[PDB]
Design a binder for this molecule. Structure first.
Ligand SMILES: CC(=O)O[C@H]1C(=O)[C@@]2(C)[C@H]([C@H](OC(=O)c3ccccc3)[C@]3(O)C[C@H](OC(=O)[C@H](O)[C@@H](NC(=O)c4ccccc4)c4ccccc4)C(C)=C1C3(C)C)[C@]1(OC(C)=O)CO[C@@H]1C[C@@H]2O
Ligand SMILES: CC(=O)O[C@H]1C(=O)[C@@]2(C)[C@H]([C@H](OC(=O)c3ccccc3)[C@]3(O)C[C@H](OC(=O)[C@H](O)[C@@H](NC(=O)c4ccccc4)c4ccccc4)C(C)=C1C3(C)C)[C@]1(OC(C)=O)CO[C@@H]1C[C@@H]2O
Ligand SMILES: Nc1nc2c(ncn2[C@@H]2O[C@H](COP(=O)(O)OP(=O)(O)OP(=O)(O)O)[C@@H](O)[C@H]2O)c(=O)[nH]1
Ligand SMILES: Nc1nc2c(ncn2[C@@H]2O[C@H](COP(=O)(O)OP(=O)(O)OP(=O)(O)O)[C@@H](O)[C@H]2O)c(=O)[nH]1
Ligand SMILES: Nc1nc2c(ncn2[C@@H]2O[C@H](COP(=O)(O)OP(=O)(O)O)[C@@H](O)[C@H]2O)c(=O)[nH]1
Ligand SMILES: Nc1nc2c(ncn2[C@@H]2O[C@H](COP(=O)(O)OP(=O)(O)O)[C@@H](O)[C@H]2O)c(=O)[nH]1
Ligand SMILES: [Mg+2]
Ligand SMILES: [Mg+2]
Lengths: 426, 430, 430, 426
């Protein structure tokens, strides 16, 4: 019944993934041992969406864990929930990607993908009706960017009609840890624009802006960033895991969210987010969830939506709430902000409403933006790429893996073609 | 004798069904396990088995499991026959072409097999009551697949159809205009009387008459079911002037394609006000002609009335009704066509409106459902084909429909056929 | 039969309405929840629903929420239908052009929809009773928007209009002269009988007759409602000489544009004095001809009377009334026109004046409302067009009206049309 | 329902603002935590006018807090009510304005306004129907004068039809703390005359005159001055927060108060004010409230109204009182003082009457004067400006920010044009 297969690539993809599995195990009431310990029948009704039943009523999550180094598998397996995953589903190399896309895609991960893909088959053949693939990765570095997009290509060729749905942490100039980040991302975005049905563009600069300007955390870690990402991952699948007044499958999102085939680079958000010391003073209700959700400080990519227009927004609400009040606020937003929505679509907002809010809050909303403002994320990567590439800097590490200079020229060409298609509807 | 098969399609049709069957069980005194403590009044809606269990003459169909698995688990799990709650694996994704061509193509021959096993238990089946959303993928595409089959399999039988239709401003989907326009062939060719209803009009009725500030869908479905109880009441009960399901159509429908009446109900009222209003027959008749109580956001004063069925129920007398419609004929703002000098079909039934005990809508001695063929409804079509035109000028979502086996030309052929219906309703007003 | 739709506009009209409906409920014995413990006397003002709840034939309209949200929360929250208490988001700001062109332009087609749903519940609707302020932005601009619609939609029906009009000295706004002069087209073209009332004249009546030293608006509205109860009493009750709402106009109005009567009521009296005065029919008749009891600050002795309607109610006999008007004809200070040799229209009704239990105005066996067409009222117009002239010579506030979509020439076209009415009332005295 | 957005600029604007939020929270019965603790339904009925509902029935005030230094945010956030405001709505720089208008308008605040304005959008989009903007600032110094008028210009361009309503503490010769005060004010008044719909001119000399000659305080602080200002701020909005016999919105004030577009420089006052040791001897009643309200010692600008004529006065009364008695006193004043009102307006007094008087007094009146006597406030600033500017003194601090000498010439030109338009109706 609409099973998902989930795949984790590199350090970032395994870290946002290993936090996601702690979040949806809390929702479904699954113990770190894999045993069920929840309150409610609704937690158990759709446990098959993310888990396999095994003997003694132990639940085993349908993750595949992929890396070119053992050290992230060792960090996940030893972690808060590490014992939950199937030992056979940890698929790994020994020598890493070197932060090189071409090691991921052509050498170190091209060896390993035959050992990954045949595990993706065992999980997809155990499904009753697979709806799709949910892949967590980063576009900087070499494992997530280059092996993860190799793996997207292989699963896309094998499962052409299932939803391919990716959560993609990607570079920005003011929060960076790699010299060759622009190269790896430009080579990787070239695969995402052709193969994925949805890609949720996420940024460490925007995830730090939520931690300082909303949550007021003094020292936000990667563990705090991974918690913001995984809340929106739990959010968008909610309507195939729980009952609701308006149900929306990942495909019911895609049909409404993607006007023209390639414009599927979304930008997620979440509400309510409150400063930890301030919760008692806030009224949780649909118009406050709306005034947070649609504000430029809440979105998890550096793009200010005031630099573009939305094509479509989806607001996937959770909790006991009025359909008049939801339909009123999703009208009031796009009429009072009409200069920020495209005027050749007569209603830009999709709504969905689940009856079951996250554990410990009365309501919640996961936001998905599609906006021409995502041109700014692809533009700044393309101009960092260009300034290195005009002087061929660092290319011997990629051409040493047998990659052509022509593949860089063709990747940055396809990047400007993606920038041009969003700028066309501005 | 006098059976109806009720088919509840997609989330909207199933959730309206979960209010319809909540009402019919109270109104006939059937427990939620299908038993009846202590006349054949139930026979229109329930088959009776020798155990003394009354099983509904209903089919529930959805292409995804979630909403019907909730019907299979809630208080009505013991009411329905387990194989007439029908589910697929795969959602229709608000895409007409998944409902019609690709996903519903698999469940249809199982849906028909249940409808055959229900019709073979009828003896003079009166018609079909088909409940759906115009905006849904299952709502538009699966209903249009099913109706095409029922219109060759049961060609003589009246197909009454209750549709949740897109609003002026309120919408839940980007592609709601595409699914609705693609449905217009279904209602024109394979339906006999099609009751359009609007979420935004009922939301305003709820605000002004029930005084509920923020309603859910449970509040809407409890109004939409109350109208079908009142359409069927003459089939189920004794009355002064009972109306047959084809007697209804012979007075509502002036021309073969002009079968899209408005519907309204009065009094919609809360327990705060029902003890201070008179709710005399004159007042609840006049309430049906207010723009404030129409369940589609269009103004009847921008039209002309072709025919009205005033279906009264509860404590009313033909004296009072004739004296009431005489004041409606006197008011120059309520304008009929020149060619309908009679105008009104009256029905009167002795059974009061049943309250759902959890509901907002109060106990009252009287109700009327007014079902009304009027030229004004063409504005609700003129709204939505202007939403369609902005998106089809760009081909704005068309690859999702072409990608699932639809001809691209069907969008032009559907906007064309809607313009010929919007022409027909303007043409007969003159 | 004999219905009236009462439309209460802006703060003044709604607050007079909150006194009108306080009175009508007591006078017909309707509880503030609309129920009636234990004849069709209520039918003029209340629709009756089958629960035994009497719902008022009223619409309350304001462009801002504050005053109607108080009606929706106070003791009458259960009396009114929740969608005939109508509110916008935005105040009219004492600007005619916000009421007429910019803000009221949005609420009007909802206000009409309620008036249609009320008129369709009538059977021989008698007319409209429209309550408003001349000085308000909603009072002038929204009433003038509404009346223009009602005068094409209901062209035959009598439109009676009760106006709180600017005083000689008392004023609450700087722009009160602008809003009042812009209203003069409404009353001339789209009204049938317009009752001007003045805050400063009632404040002086309160001081001299009720002996209340410092009154609020609740004291004024309890006098203004008492006059409309007495105008409508012949529609509601048995009498010796009942007066129809058009029979009233056929005796009040000598010429098509000469439909601005004064109004007065007697006895206005407190419980300190009502037990020592005789309050014979002769005294309460003579009290209506004193300048001291006119509810506009103008002197009737500076005019000539065209016609008087003496509408008596309670314990009176036609002997006494004829003997009274014979003394009024004898007094040379009360001067009629040469062309009205009859002068007096008499009405007599058997129902005494109802006391509001919280009120200052005492229980009495008798009352008269005198409604009186006289040339003297042109001085209340000559006061206010001299206030207008000082401000329009500077264009003193005109940018607020021009800024909200009004033509600047409408101020000249309104001062012009007022000078033609002030001409007409001087012309017929001769 | 007629929401207001409130904005605080510089030290003075954040201090009169942070006191205003203590006053209207006492009125609406809101706890320093943001929780509601009031007596009455009328306190809650219009709480949306100044607050947002948040989870747990906590109320969050719709303030934006703007400064170029952290130290006033630190002083507000740590203060009596500091924990009430949204952490995201504190928008601030690090290096101050230096008491320089050109740092506010062109350099230090021109950087920051992009971060302010996008918060003013989140609050205005959360509104159901916004009526206007209520901005607190000073015209001396550089943050309130130069950044606050930059922000007025940006919000005016974005919201052209909403009420722009400013409370403006401004210079006078006998109570001064800055050398360049005349420059900053003359550059700032040039923005207020064009953009605002109302400006309430307030003076520290007049606020000290109320403290010594009325209240008989021995040592009045800025906290005591801020309490007089914030009483009249609560006063003028009362009729959209509470029911009344005569309701007046801020727009119903403006239509009656502003005869010609630019003559909107008002002069506020409040009654009853009594010496703290004398209250038991005073009768609170409409003719005593009137004999205080219309007397030259009560108004909060240095202008004696006996040096001009009023155009319009608005008296916004609060409490259970007679309309005859209010209408009698507002007649008796302008007939017995007829030489002090313009004689081309036939009634110079607007009245309004709210049913709910301030907590702890039986009645109150907020006074708003528009008078040709406000020429004296603009004249004395213009002559202090002139005496420095004839010798170009201090101009290198402003021209160093890239400002022209021509902008000083054009500001003082526009100042004398405002003086001339009030002196024209004298
Ligand atoms: C008493 C009270 O109000 O507790 C809240 C709380 O104070 C606040 C501040 C919580 C708290 O969130 C954080 O501290 C936080 C820190 C970094 C990054 C993200 C969150 C909370 O920890 C988070 C926690 O939320 C959940 O448990 C959700 O179900 C969430 N899952 C987890 O956070 C989780 C934690 C550990 C293990 C497994 C799951 C979730 C979100 C989306 C979809 C599914 C589940 C809640 C309600 C609270 C606390 C406990 C203080 C907030 O988070 C959520 C998701 O509600 C942060 O802003 C909201 C507003 C809440 O009021
Ligand atoms: C027993 C008694 O009569 O107490 C009075 C009092 O003695 C007097 C002197 C008060 C008092 O005012 C002052 O001491 C004061 C000092 C400096 C600046 C301004 C005021 C009082 O403190 C002030 C206080 O007023 C209020 O509380 C108002 O609601 C006011 N809000 C606040 O002052 C406030 C204080 C703390 C926290 C939050 C609000 C207000 C004004 C306008 C609009 C809304 C609210 C009142 C009645 C009094 C005391 C307590 C002595 C006076 O003030 C007011 C606003 O009434 C000063 O002249 C009046 C006349 C009063 O009689
Ligand atoms: N009144 C009412 N309207 C509903 C209800 N459920 C859904 N709707 C309406 O349904 C319309 C959209 O159709 P869907 O709910 O997506 O119909 P569906 O058949 O389930 O569509 P698919 O998921 O694609 O199969 C919206 O305009 C909703 O307002 C309900 O219970 N009551
Ligand atoms: N007698 C009486 N007069 C009132 C009352 N309320 C207001 N007035 C008069 O109303 C006149 C001004 O009109 P407004 O009250 O401002 O009318 P409005 O329609 O609410 O105007 P807007 O606010 O602009 O929409 C004044 O001359 C008042 O004396 C009331 O309850 N009784
Ligand atoms: N949110 C998040 N970001 C991470 C985490 N670890 C690394 N990143 C960041 O995103 C990039 C991820 O690249 P990485 O995963 O190291 O490359 P790979 O291992 O070769 O795929 C790094 O440069 C970091 O800036 C993590 O746990 N969470
Ligand atoms: N009423 C009041 N006036 C103040 C306050 N603080 C400063 N002022 C005065 O008004 C002027 C305000 O300027 P300031 O706010 O310091 O300039 P800015 O911070 O650059 O905007 C000062 O020169 C003081 O005379 C305060 O708390 N209240
Ligand atoms: Mg569906
Ligand atoms: Mg008003």
């Amino acid at each position: 019944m609409r099973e998902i297969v989930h795949l984790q690539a590199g350090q970032c993809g395994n870290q946002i993934g290993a936090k996601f599995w702690e979040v949806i195990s809390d929702e479904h009431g699954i113990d770190p041992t894999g045993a069920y310990h929840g309150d409610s029948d609704l937690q158990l009704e759709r446990i098959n969406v993310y888990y396999n039943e095994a003997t003694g009523g132990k639940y085993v999550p349908r993750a595949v864990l992929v890396d070119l180094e053992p050290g992230t598998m060792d960090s996940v397996r030893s972690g808060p929930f590490g014992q939950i995953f199937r030992p056979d589903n940890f698929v790994f190399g020994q020598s890493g990607a070197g932060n090189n896309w071409a090691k991921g895609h052509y050498t170190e991960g091209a060896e390993l993908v035959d050992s990954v893909l045949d595990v993706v088959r065992k999980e997809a053949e155990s499904c009753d009706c697979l709806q799709g693939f949910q892949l967590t990765h980063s576009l900087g570095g070499g494992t997530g960017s280059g092996m993860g997009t190799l793996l997207i290509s292989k699963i896309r060729e094998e499962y052409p009609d299932r939803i391919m749905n990716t959560f993609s942490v990607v570079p920005s100039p003011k929060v960076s840890d790699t010299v060759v980040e622009p190269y790896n991302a430009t080579l990787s975005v070239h695969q995402l624009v052709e193969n994925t049905d949805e890609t949720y563009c996420i940024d460490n600069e925007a995830l730090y802006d939520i931690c300082f300007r909303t949550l007021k955390l003094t020292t936000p870690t990667y563990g705090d960033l991974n918690h913001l990402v995984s809340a929106t991952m739990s959010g968008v699948t909610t309507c195939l895991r729980f009952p609701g007044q308006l149900n929306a499958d990942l495909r019911k999102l895609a049909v409404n969210m993607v006007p023209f085939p390639r414009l599927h680079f979304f930008m997620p958000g979440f509400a309510p987010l409150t400063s930890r010391g301030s919760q008692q003073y806030r009224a949780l209700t649909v118009p406050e969830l709306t005034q947070q959700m649609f504000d430029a400080k809440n979105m998890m990519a550096a793009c200010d939506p005031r630099h573009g227009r939305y094509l479509t927004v989806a607001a996937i609400f959770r909790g006991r709430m009025s359909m008049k009040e939801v339909d009123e606020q999703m009208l009031n937003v796009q009429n009072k902000n009409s200069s920020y929505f495209v005027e050749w679509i007569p209603n830009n907002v999709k709504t969905a409403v689940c009856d079951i809010p996250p554990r410990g809050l009365k309501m919640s909303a996961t936001f998905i933006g599609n906006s021409t403002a995502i041109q700014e994320l692809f533009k700044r990567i393309s101009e960092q790429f260009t300034a290195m590439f005009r002087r061929k800097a660092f290319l011997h590490w990629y051409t040493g893996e047998g990659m052509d200079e022509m593949e860089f020229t063709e990747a940055e060409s396809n990047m400007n073609d993606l920038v041009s298609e969003y700028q066309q509807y501005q | 004798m006098r059976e109806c098969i009720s088919v509840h399609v997609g989330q909207a049709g199933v959730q309206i069904g979960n209010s319809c069957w909540e009402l019919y069980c109270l109104e006939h005194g059937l427990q939620p396990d299908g038993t009846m403590p202590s006349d054949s009044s139930f026979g229109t809606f329930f088959s009776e088995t020798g155990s003394g269990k009354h099983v509904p003459r209903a089919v529930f169909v959805d292409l995804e499991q979630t909403v019907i698995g909730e019907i299979r688990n809630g208080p009505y799990r013991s009411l329905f026959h387990p194989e007439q709650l029908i589910t697929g694996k795969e959602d229709a994704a608000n895409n007409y072409a998944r409902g019609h061509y690709t996903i519903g193509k698999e469940l249809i021959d199982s849906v028909l097999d249940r409808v055959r096993k229900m019709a073979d238990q009828c003896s003079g089946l009166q018609g079909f009551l088909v409940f759906h959303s115009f905006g849904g993928g299952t709502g538009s595409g699966f209903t249009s697949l099913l109706m095409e089959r029922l219109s060759v399999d049961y060609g003589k039988k009246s197909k009454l159809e209750f549709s949740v239709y897109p609003a002026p401003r309120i919408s839940t989907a980007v592609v709601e205009p595409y699914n609705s326009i693609l449905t217009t062939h279904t209602t024109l060719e394979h339906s006999d009387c099609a009751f359009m209803v609007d979420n935004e009009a009922i939301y305003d009725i709820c605000n002004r008459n029930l005084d509920i500030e923020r309603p859910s869908y449970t509040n809407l479905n409890r109004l939409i079911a109350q109208i079908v109880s009142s359409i069927t009441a003459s089939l189920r009960f004794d009355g002064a002037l009972n109306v047959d399901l084809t007697e209804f159509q012979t007075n509502l429908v002036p021309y073969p394609r002009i079968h899209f009446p408005l519907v309204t109900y009065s009094p919609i009222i809360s327990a705060e006000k029902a003890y201070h209003e008179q709710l005399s027959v004159p007042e609840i008749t006049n309430a049906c002609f207010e723009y404030s109580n129409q369940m589609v956001k269009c103004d009847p004063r921008r039209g002309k009335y072709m025919a009205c069925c005033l279906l009264y129920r509860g404590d009313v007398v033909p004296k009072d009704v004739n004296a009431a419609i005489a004041a409606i004929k006197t008011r120059r703002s309520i304008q009929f066509v020149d060619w309908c000098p009679t105008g009104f079909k009256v029905g009167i039934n002795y059974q009061p409106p049943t309250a759902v005990p959890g509901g907002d809508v109060a106990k009252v001695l009287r109700a009327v459902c007014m079902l009304s063929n009027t030229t004004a409804i063409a504005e609700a079509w003129a709204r939505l084909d202007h939403k369609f035109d902005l998106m089809y000028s760009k081909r704005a979502f068309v690859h999702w429909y072409v990608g699932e086996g639809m001809e691209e030309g069907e969008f032009s052929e559907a906007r064309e056929d809607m313009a010929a219906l919007e022409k027909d309703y303007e043409e007969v007003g003159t």
